[PDB]
Amino acid sequence: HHVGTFENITAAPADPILGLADLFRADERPGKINLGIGVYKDETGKTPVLTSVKKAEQYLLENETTKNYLGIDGIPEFGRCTQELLFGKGSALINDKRARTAQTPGGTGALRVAADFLAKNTSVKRVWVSNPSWPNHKSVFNSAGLEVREYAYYDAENHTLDFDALINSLNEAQAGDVVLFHGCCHNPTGIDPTLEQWQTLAQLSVEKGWLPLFDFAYQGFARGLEEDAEGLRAFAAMHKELIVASSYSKNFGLYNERVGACTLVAADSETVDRAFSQMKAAIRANYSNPPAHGASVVATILSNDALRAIWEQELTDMRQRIQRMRQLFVNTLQEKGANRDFSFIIKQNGMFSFSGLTKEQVLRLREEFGVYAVASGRVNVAGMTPDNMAPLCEAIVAVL
Amino acid sequence: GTFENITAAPADPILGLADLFRADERPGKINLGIGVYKDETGKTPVLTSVKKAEQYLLENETTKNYLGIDGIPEFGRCTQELLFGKGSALINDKRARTAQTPGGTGALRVAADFLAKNTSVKRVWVSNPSWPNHKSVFNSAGLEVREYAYYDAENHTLDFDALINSLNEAQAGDVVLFHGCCHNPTGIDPTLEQWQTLAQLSVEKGWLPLFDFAYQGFARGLEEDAEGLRAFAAMHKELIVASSYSKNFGLYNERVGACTLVAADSETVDRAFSQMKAAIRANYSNPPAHGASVVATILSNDALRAIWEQELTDMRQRIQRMRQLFVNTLQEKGANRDFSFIIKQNGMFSFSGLTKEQVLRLREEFGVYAVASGRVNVAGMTPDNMAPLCEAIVAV
């Protein structure tokens, strides 16, 4: 007799997000509101395919003549467009050929590729991430055998970035450790360093010898494409080495096509080309080469003046809708009688903020009013609309 | 600097060769070193069933919101039916779970990570020779790769005694990898009786079989090409299958594959699959929809499926025709020795039996490109290039 290889495996814990989504689906109330979603929604509550994307997909259907494998690093034009978005069209990094980009299956894939590359080719042992954390970071880095440590970030009592605690906590990060920064729209707080704080962090990193890793999944959702990259660029002006994991899931509405990139920056072209050869090996041992459809949509849009303009307007529309919902939420809470300051909501960037509500209050909102947020009190402001704002805010006031 | 002392990866000789071919000004150049299917015009076209399905998707898709970790459920159902047969006892007993993955390579990786983190598997046995990327994928998960005997290069055969004897070294709990059909790169597959002998031996020895199935439909047909796997499924408690639709749908760059787990019963496979999902979440989160949606759309639609099956038949038939034309043309050109084995082999690849010296000669003197191993891809052959190709082969 041979015991089965799977016979004694312990089940993984159930996905609590999936559970909450099922509870929301079962709720019979016509007034139910779901602020626990993780993606953008428009004014009608849909997560539509962008029009620029539909147009790009029509062009591909018309023009594609093969599905032969891409190179390991993906579509060359997609790589160039990515570097321009990250560093700016006239960048010294680009001119000096200091950066190399691999197209990856989403920003999550980019993070895994970065982790595997670091674990097998460098002495990196630790990655520092902010508190509160984006849970997937830990799973990805740990899978490669890298430890993850948290640095202080969010001050929940005061709804702010406690910069002094941040700097303090980071003194414990050693030379050669990785420190991870969200480029913009910090997830889940929506609190980003000011440009002056970015510059301060950039100097501290050079000083302490950290390897910065930027997670860039919301470019364009804070203020604009170029503006949202200033923090990254402040680091790039100062650093010999960077890694950037970027995603087009959010800003192109391309979630399920898995469109992202991993970008290495080194002191010079000779060094980055050498490093990148090992990043390619890490990709080859994983999924071989990346999925074409989504990245080709992105390259198609970015390289065509007319399409690019359509897409830039769609992204501006999404950004402006989120800002409109942030303002309206604050104003409506005041109007409905919250008699309490929620103004921090206006100073936060992107889809997510902590509401400041307690676990108890969040539970009451669900049970008593059919308003769904995650237990942490994080809300997705894109789940708000002119249509549902009033009842949402009445319910919130009722539990304060 | 953190990147300062990084040692460069070795040059990829396959890419180097393709670069060479591209940078060859000689007009009669022929590339038999390709890794994909080519039609009689030398193109790797998008299938008509695929273009039709892509049009359905353009109309029906109203969102790109994330798929679940295991991908599109109909894609998994259709995959299990292709592998095991509709009304299979396995499927009826709910013993199988399937995750859609980024190609068969992604499936192999997901399998390797799942095994490394959740089981006592330490070693994977692969045939000598075979797909060079098996070692990189399993090694990346910290699994050792050992090789078992398979191919007798002088006699152009599967040396079955050597196979069996060499696997005596595989321990209970080791994984043994089998190609489901069109063994890559020999094109030599076990007969049904040999598959049945291996299935029985594998149960006695306690091996965990892992089937790599990237060419279903290219040997004899969809159901025939799965008979080996199904012989294993008849008697094994556990199996893993890494399958690919890159080849049989011509969907290479859309990264369409699946990792299927089979356990003794439904509750067991649920536990195992929960941890496979964790391994996916920590890699690429959830899989790319477009390619897999094309496959599910075709396989679940009678009309499109019929178009696709004919296209697959046409590809299989073109390969068979090139194998025969190659042999007959070699003889006409007064080759010399018996290349008959070329007719007996399955899929796009065979070893030509040419020594490495002979291969260099072909590239340098005749601009005919093959791999150093002597491997050729017969889909690189066409009626119009066969004579020139075979003249050059004769000359060496």
Side-chain angles (χ1 to χ4, degrees), chain A residues 1-283 285-358 360-400, chain B residues 1-280 282-396:
Chain A
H1 166 71
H2 301 290
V3 177
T5 296
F6 308 151
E7 169 168 333
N8 303 311
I9 297 179
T10 304
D15 189 348
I17 303 171
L18 212 55
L20 218 224
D22 293 340
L23 210 47
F24 175 81
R25 275 186 286 268
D27 194 320
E28 77 294 340
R29 292 174 281 198
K32 61 186 184 185
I33 299 166
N34 189 0
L35 306 182
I37 54 162
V39 296
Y40 180 77
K41 288 204 190 162
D42 69 13
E43 63 286 351
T44 72
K46 292 173 221 164
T47 302
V49 182
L50 290 181
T51 298
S52 52
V53 168
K54 284 296 191 181
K55 292 185 186 291
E57 289 183 306
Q58 185 191 0
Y59 179 94
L60 293 178
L61 179 58
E62 293 168 0
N63 292 274
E64 278 179 359
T65 60
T66 186
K67 301 288 197 179
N68 199 6
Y69 296 108
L70 304 179
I72 297 168
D73 51 353
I75 301 170
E77 184 71 18
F78 171 88
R80 298 192 288 273
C81 290
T82 298
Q83 288 183 357
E84 300 193 14
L85 245 16
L86 293 180
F87 303 118
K89 214 160 85 300
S91 166
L93 274 61
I94 292 173
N95 293 329
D96 298 2
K97 300 185 182 311
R98 287 183 52 211
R100 295 292 294 281
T101 298
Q103 175 195 328
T104 56
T108 304
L111 286 161
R112 177 61 179 270
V113 169
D116 286 340
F117 159 78
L118 291 169
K120 296 300 146 248
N121 301 282
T122 71
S123 48
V124 177
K125 298 305 178 184
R126 278 173 301 283
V127 185
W128 291 81
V129 305
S130 59
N131 170 262
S133 58
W134 185 65
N136 284 333
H137 282 143
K138 182 171 166 63
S139 308
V140 174
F141 294 122
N142 281 176
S143 83
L146 304 169
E147 190 190 359
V148 166
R149 291 287 310 268
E150 288 196 11
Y151 59 83
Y153 193 85
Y154 183 55
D155 175 346
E157 197 171 341
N158 303 311
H159 318 282
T160 60
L161 200 192
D162 189 347
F163 197 73
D164 287 9
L166 170 31
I167 292 311
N168 216 80
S169 66
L170 275 190
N171 288 326
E172 179 175 340
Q174 300 194 250
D177 279 0
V178 160
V179 178
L180 187 152
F181 303 94
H182 296 218
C184 76
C185 303
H186 184 271
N187 183 349
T189 72
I191 304 167
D192 298 329
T194 59
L195 180 61
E196 184 159 89
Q197 294 174 326
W198 277 125
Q199 287 164 342
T200 300
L201 287 165
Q203 168 159 353
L204 185 62
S205 293
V206 177
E207 186 182 324
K208 289 273 192 170
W210 306 328
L211 178 61
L213 165 59
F214 275 73
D215 184 328
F216 213 4
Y218 294 99
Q219 187 178 12
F221 277 101
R223 287 180 298 170
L225 297 168
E226 296 297 304
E227 288 164 272
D228 292 0
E230 301 185 338
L232 172 54
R233 291 172 192 182
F235 265 71
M238 206 157 290
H239 276 265
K240 285 180 169 164
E241 291 166 341
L242 297 166
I243 300 181
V244 186
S246 59
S247 179
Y248 297 96
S249 288
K250 333 92 175 242
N251 57 14
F252 282 82
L254 283 174
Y255 313 92
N256 75 12
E257 303 289 15
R258 323 303 304 119
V259 193
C262 187
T263 298
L264 290 186
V265 175
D268 55 35
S269 63
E270 186 280 329
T271 295
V272 78
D273 289 351
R274 193 149 38 86
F276 197 61
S277 74
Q278 292 287 12
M279 176 162 294
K280 288 173 163 180
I283 293 166
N286 189 342
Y287 53 83
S288 201
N289 46 74
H293 184 74
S296 189
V297 164
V298 169
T300 297
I301 290 167
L302 290 180
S303 74
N304 178 273
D305 291 336
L307 241 38
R308 185 170 182 135
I310 294 177
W311 163 73
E312 289 197 18
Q313 182 70 51
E314 287 165 332
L315 180 56
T316 291
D317 288 349
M318 289 189 280
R319 179 179 64 252
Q320 298 178 345
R321 194 185 101 69
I322 293 167
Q323 292 165 338
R324 190 174 321 123
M325 290 306 101
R326 287 179 171 281
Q327 190 66 240
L328 183 64
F329 181 63
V330 176
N331 294 343
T332 304
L333 286 164
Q334 179 60 9
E335 165 206 339
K336 292 296 178 183
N339 198 39
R340 169 168 152 177
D341 177 39
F342 279 92
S343 70
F344 58 87
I345 290 295
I346 301 184
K347 291 149 187 180
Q348 289 165 2
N349 291 322
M351 286 188 237
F352 305 112
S353 285
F354 287 105
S355 64
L357 299 171
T358 61
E360 305 84 82
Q361 279 167 333
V362 169
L363 174 60
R364 184 172 178 198
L365 277 168
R366 184 174 80 217
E367 297 184 304
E368 193 166 323
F369 300 103
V371 172
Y372 287 68
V374 297
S376 70
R378 185 198 83 223
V379 297
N380 185 333
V381 312
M384 304 177 185
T385 66
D387 300 86
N388 72 17
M389 187 70 78
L392 162 64
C393 290
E394 298 178 357
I396 290 174
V397 164
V399 306
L400 295 176
Chain B
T2 301
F3 308 152
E4 246 158 67
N5 298 338
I6 292 172
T7 310
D12 172 38
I14 299 308
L15 179 71
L17 194 62
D19 288 347
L20 240 94
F21 185 83
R22 274 184 282 269
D24 186 310
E25 208 88 3
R26 300 177 292 191
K29 59 183 184 188
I30 299 183
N31 193 358
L32 302 184
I34 53 160
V36 300
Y37 178 84
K38 282 196 172 173
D39 62 15
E40 73 286 347
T41 67
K43 302 170 200 173
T44 300
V46 183
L47 275 57
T48 297
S49 53
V50 168
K51 284 288 191 188
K52 292 176 173 290
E54 289 186 310
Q55 181 63 253
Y56 289 32
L57 298 190
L58 256 192
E59 303 317 308
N60 298 346
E61 284 178 349
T62 59
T63 186
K64 307 293 201 166
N65 201 0
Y66 295 110
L67 302 179
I69 290 169
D70 42 1
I72 300 167
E74 179 69 18
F75 172 90
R77 182 183 68 75
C78 289
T79 292
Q80 293 182 0
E81 295 190 8
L82 276 176
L83 288 179
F84 301 121
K86 183 183 286 286
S88 165
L90 267 63
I91 296 173
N92 292 336
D93 297 349
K94 306 188 67 52
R95 293 173 58 201
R97 297 289 186 280
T98 292
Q100 177 197 325
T101 57
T105 304
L108 290 163
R109 172 55 101 83
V110 165
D113 286 338
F114 158 73
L115 290 173
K117 293 296 190 165
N118 299 280
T119 78
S120 59
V121 172
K122 287 148 185 94
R123 273 170 308 268
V124 177
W125 294 80
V126 304
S127 58
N128 169 252
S130 66
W131 201 57
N133 206 34
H134 280 144
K135 176 170 169 68
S136 55
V137 175
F138 299 114
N139 283 169
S140 85
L143 273 12
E144 184 187 20
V145 167
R146 293 285 316 272
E147 296 191 345
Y148 63 84
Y150 193 79
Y151 181 62
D152 173 343
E154 58 199 292
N155 294 306
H156 308 99
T157 59
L158 190 175
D159 185 343
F160 195 76
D161 299 290
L163 174 31
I164 299 299
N165 295 340
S166 70
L167 281 177
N168 271 326
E169 189 171 15
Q171 293 297 290
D174 287 352
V175 169
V176 177
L177 189 152
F178 297 101
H179 295 218
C181 77
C182 306
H183 179 269
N184 186 351
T186 63
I188 301 179
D189 295 329
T191 63
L192 180 62
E193 189 183 344
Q194 283 171 335
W195 277 125
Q196 294 169 332
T197 293
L198 289 172
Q200 175 71 79
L201 172 64
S202 162
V203 168
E204 298 166 338
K205 243 64 165 66
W207 303 331
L208 176 55
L210 181 166
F211 273 76
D212 177 328
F213 204 10
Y215 296 101
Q216 187 179 11
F218 279 95
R220 295 176 293 164
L222 292 170
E223 301 300 305
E224 299 93 331
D225 290 3
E227 288 178 354
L229 170 59
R230 297 182 185 171
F232 268 72
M235 43 194 44
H236 274 78
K237 297 304 181 176
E238 296 170 332
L239 295 168
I240 296 176
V241 187
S243 56
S244 182
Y245 295 100
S246 283
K247 318 101 159 221
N248 59 11
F249 279 79
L251 285 175
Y252 313 91
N253 70 14
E254 297 294 10
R255 318 306 299 125
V256 193
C259 186
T260 292
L261 239 47
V262 172
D265 56 37
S266 177
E267 69 84 9
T268 301
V269 78
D270 279 346
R271 294 182 277 129
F273 195 59
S274 74
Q275 299 285 6
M276 181 164 282
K277 291 184 194 168
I280 291 163
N283 190 343
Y284 54 82
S285 206
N286 43 73
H290 187 71
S293 188
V294 164
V295 173
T297 293
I298 288 168
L299 293 177
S300 68
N301 181 279
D302 290 335
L304 295 180
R305 184 176 184 124
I307 295 170
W308 166 71
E309 295 201 13
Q310 182 65 59
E311 294 184 283
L312 179 56
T313 291
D314 296 345
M315 282 182 300
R316 179 182 56 256
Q317 281 177 357
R318 196 186 104 69
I319 291 162
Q320 294 170 333
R321 182 180 316 126
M322 295 301 89
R323 294 180 165 279
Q324 184 75 71
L325 182 59
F326 182 61
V327 172
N328 288 346
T329 301
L330 249 18
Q331 174 174 329
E332 161 184 8
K333 296 299 175 181
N336 183 275
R337 53 196 214 191
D338 168 283
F339 283 89
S340 294
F341 56 92
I342 289 303
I343 271 52
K344 307 192 187 80
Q345 287 166 356
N346 286 335
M348 305 186 199
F349 304 115
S350 285
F351 282 150
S352 58
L354 271 46
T355 62
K356 38 181 164 183
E357 302 195 3
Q358 292 164 309
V359 168
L360 185 57
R361 185 83 178 289
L362 281 165
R363 165 178 48 256
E364 292 172 317
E365 199 177 325
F366 295 106
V368 171
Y369 287 54
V371 184
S373 67
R375 185 195 86 221
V376 301
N377 178 331
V378 298
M381 300 172 182
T382 65
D384 297 338
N385 77 13
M386 195 70 73
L389 160 65
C390 285
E391 295 174 12
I393 290 176
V394 169
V396 314

